[PDB]
């Protein structure tokens, strides 16, 4: 079967045959859609299809489809997969996997660099202290002195599920929320959970409003141990305004490397439940979402004093304004500091340019719109007015539940 | 089977039941998700008859009463002999106020319990149409105090009998592909401009050229007729701090009257529906002025703000869809035409959705279109997850008519 999908901005029409290759489900049905919902231990018999897709896809790429090496290497994992109830990568496929997971994150506006993607591989590492040292070299890496490298890495898989690798913090990087008696947030206000355990674990918090956490590393299903990211490793910009000098007193900064780490990576069937991975930021997650966001630093107000513009009435666009100047101090003071950094305008410019190349090549590139489309400014950009489709393709990043809800304490 | 969904921002859960009455098909499946897409006899009538009269019967508090079974039975009876049947005028505006209530794309749906309904069923002629529509026209603009209504034509027999307004809304602009090879006026409008003239309306041949109404009644071949112009209420643009604003030579019409849909209600099928509003600001001034395909007008705007427009990263972009977005605003409301901004608009929408669910166990929304075209996250549809399906009755899109008309 064929999906055709429009862009209503230039009547370009694709059409796309790829989704004939999920199986996973979406949450919805023929009577109900369920796009904007956020949130919508592997037997012997479940796992040879499971290995036995992925291989078959690799070798497709590689050209070797049904070769001797292809069919030697489906025995091999069957065999393993019998003696020992699972199987191991060999390192080009865990490569090409993890990039395949980026490639196929339906969520992701970035994709059109999924092919450069360095790859660590980590599944040598036994405690918590491996865990640390590998994150600073991936930290240090990716960051290189501003110049932003994508990077990944990899922890040992999933074997029973009582001794997974996890990294507790939602992404390595992220500022300390701390709650106060008289109910206001000093920091961020996303943390103040992760935070609260991490002093109970006793890490000595400064309580100010930009605090780098401390990473909380379990490896092996262990308890989890507080390390502090050499702070020299940690590169931060000061966030100031090309004509405002005002807002520089804001006192507003923020971190250069987005890294989520909470997500599981699942290759072939096998279950990464540690695989941080890092980019660089589109302008409007920090200046849109972490700024403005009412749940979080919640700047708006403070700016749009500043500015002097008429509160009294939403239909000045007070808050529209002062949105548009924060996202413009965001994008200025990372390019003065050099820092890789996207407009929204440039982002999804090229997430069509990678869509159309990938409904070319590929025969389709699952999208959800509703994360796609950038959190300001909406239809002027070219993605507001692409039809896209979503659905789930294996490898994949999956959402799995916070440690701290599931971890058994050794104590 | 029982569905929650959660608003991120404040951690208010909602359950939904309602969407297990949910009738027709979404183009979801578990495989595939298609919210983005615009687009996704006897027998077959009683059944949605008598869906729709328990629903009816219900919200009166008379279920299961004589009156109820005794309907039902004279409806059960016209549908055997006649083949169709007749709505009374409570059940027709009950359809039609239900039909908006049930409209998931639409924010302003708190308002969906004040529709004034006006009952064309015995309008025959087109010209009878015309004069239905300008009294809608006039009686919704109320001389911008606007208020909503809907006029409802007779329903479809066989299918080679329908009333159609050709108009998408009662009011809009001409287009015209010109000699240069860009387009004067409204580019949404070219395909319906040139059946006009064909038809033989004599176009002004400018920017804001207010078109004729094409009217199909009985099936017959459509006619023009000129809207009066003094019933057409137009607000020029200006902006409160830019002098240079009123030079761009902007307007927009004040009713927002969509003409082109089909209303179902309980298996009747109304295809000349013709309903009116008030405007969200954004509708005009981030799509309708600011649209690649529409009026385009970003670049002149930039350029006379004196922005820096080589890099995409100064947000010049951004910086003048507000201005122009403020200037829609302040334009509507120093006439004293009856607008709402994207901010109200929301808040009052998630105000109507926490009613829906507490008062009759959900609301269908459609996220992708709920969420306004600028400024998404700072208002706070953004953070509600919604559900959509689809409920009856409803208002449904259909084929254009010039594709379906034979001359
Ligand atoms: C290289 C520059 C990149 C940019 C500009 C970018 C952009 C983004 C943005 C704006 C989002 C939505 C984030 C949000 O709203 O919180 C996102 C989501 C996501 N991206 Fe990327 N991305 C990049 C690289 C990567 C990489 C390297 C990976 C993995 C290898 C990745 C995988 C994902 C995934 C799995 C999501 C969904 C996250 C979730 O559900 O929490 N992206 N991307
Ligand atoms: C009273 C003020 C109203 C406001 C502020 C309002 C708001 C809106 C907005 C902003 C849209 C999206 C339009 C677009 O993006 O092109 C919309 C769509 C829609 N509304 Fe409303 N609405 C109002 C009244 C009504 C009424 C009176 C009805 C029916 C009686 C209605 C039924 C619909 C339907 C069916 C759609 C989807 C139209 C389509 O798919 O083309 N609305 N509404
Ligand atoms: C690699 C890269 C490039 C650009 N940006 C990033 C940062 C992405 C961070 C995502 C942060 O999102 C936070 C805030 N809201 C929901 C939460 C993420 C999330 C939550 C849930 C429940 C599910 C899900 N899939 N994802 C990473
Ligand atoms: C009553 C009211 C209140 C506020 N605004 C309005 C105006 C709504 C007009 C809708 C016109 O929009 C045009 C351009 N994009 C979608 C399209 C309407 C539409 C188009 C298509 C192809 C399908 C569909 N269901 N609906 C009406
Ligand atoms: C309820 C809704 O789906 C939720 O707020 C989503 C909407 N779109 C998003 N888009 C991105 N990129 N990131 C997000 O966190 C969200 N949140
Ligand atoms: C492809 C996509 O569905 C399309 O551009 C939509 C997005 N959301 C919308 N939302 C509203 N209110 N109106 C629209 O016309 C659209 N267009
Ligand atoms: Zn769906």
Redesign the interface.
């Known amino acids: 079967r064929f999906?055709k999908?429009?862009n209503?901005?230039t009547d370009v029409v694709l059409t796309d045959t790829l989704?004939l290759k999920?199986?996973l489900?979406?949450?919805?049905?023929?009577?109900?859609?369920?796009?904007?919902?956020?949130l919508p231990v592997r037997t012997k018999d479940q796992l040879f299809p499971l290995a036995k897709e992925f291989l078959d896809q690799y070798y497709s790429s590689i050209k070797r489809f049904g070769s001797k090496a292809h069919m030697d290497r489906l025995e091999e994992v069957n065999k393993e997969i019998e003696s020992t109830s699972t199987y191991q990568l060999k390192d080009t496929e865990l490569i090409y996997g993890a990039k395949h997971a980026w490639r196929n994150a339906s969520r992701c506006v970035g994709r059109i660099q999924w092919s450069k993607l360095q790859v660590f591989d980590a599944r040598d590492c036994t405690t918590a202290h491996g865990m640390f040292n590998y994150i600073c070299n991936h930290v240090k890496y990716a960051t290189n002195k501003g110049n932003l490298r994508s990077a990944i890495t990899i922890f040992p898989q999933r074997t029973d599920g009582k001794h997974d690798f996890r990294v507790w913090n939602s992404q390595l990087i992220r500022y300390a929320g701390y709650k106060q008696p008289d109910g206001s947030t000093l920091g961020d206000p996303a943390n103040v959970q992760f935070t609260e355990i991490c002093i109970q674990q006793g890490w000595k918090a400064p309580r100010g409003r930009f605090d780098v956490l401390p990473l909380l590393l379990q490896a092996n299903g262990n308890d989890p141990e507080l390390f502090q990211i050499p702070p020299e490793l940690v590169l931060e910009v000061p966030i100031r305004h090309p004509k405002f000098d005002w807002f520089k007193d804001l006192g507003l900064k923020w971190y250069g490397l987005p890294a989520v780490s909470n997500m599981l990576l699942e290759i072939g069937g096998l279950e990464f439940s540690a695989c941080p991975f890092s980019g660089w930021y589109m302008?409007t997650e920090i200046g849109?979402?972490n700024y403005?966001?009412?749940?979080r630093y919640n700047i708006?107000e403070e700016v749009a004093k500043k500015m002097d513009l008429d509160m009294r009435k939403?239909?000045?666009?007070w808050?529209?304004?002062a949105?548009?100047e924060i996202?413009?101090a965001v994008?200025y003071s990372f390019?003065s500091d050099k820092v890789t950094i996207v407009?929204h305008?440039?982002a999804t410019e090229s997430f069509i340019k990678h869509m159309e190349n990938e409904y070319r090549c590929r025969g389709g590139c699952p999208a959800?719109?509703?994360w796609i489309?950038?959190?300001?400014?909406?239809?002027?950009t070219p993605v507001?007015?692409?039809?896209?489709?979503?659905?789930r393709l294996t490898p994949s990043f999956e959402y799995q539940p916070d440690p701290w809800n599931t971890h058994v304490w050794k104590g």
């Open positions: 999906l999908v429009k209503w901005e989704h999920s199986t489900e979406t949450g919805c049905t023929e009577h109900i859609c369920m796009g904007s919902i956020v302008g849109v979402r403005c966001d009412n749940s708006l939403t239909s000045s666009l808050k529209d304004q949105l548009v996202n413009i994008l390019q407009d305008h440039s959800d719109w509703v489309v950038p959190p300001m400014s909406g239809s002027i507001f007015h692409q039809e896209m489709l979503n659905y």
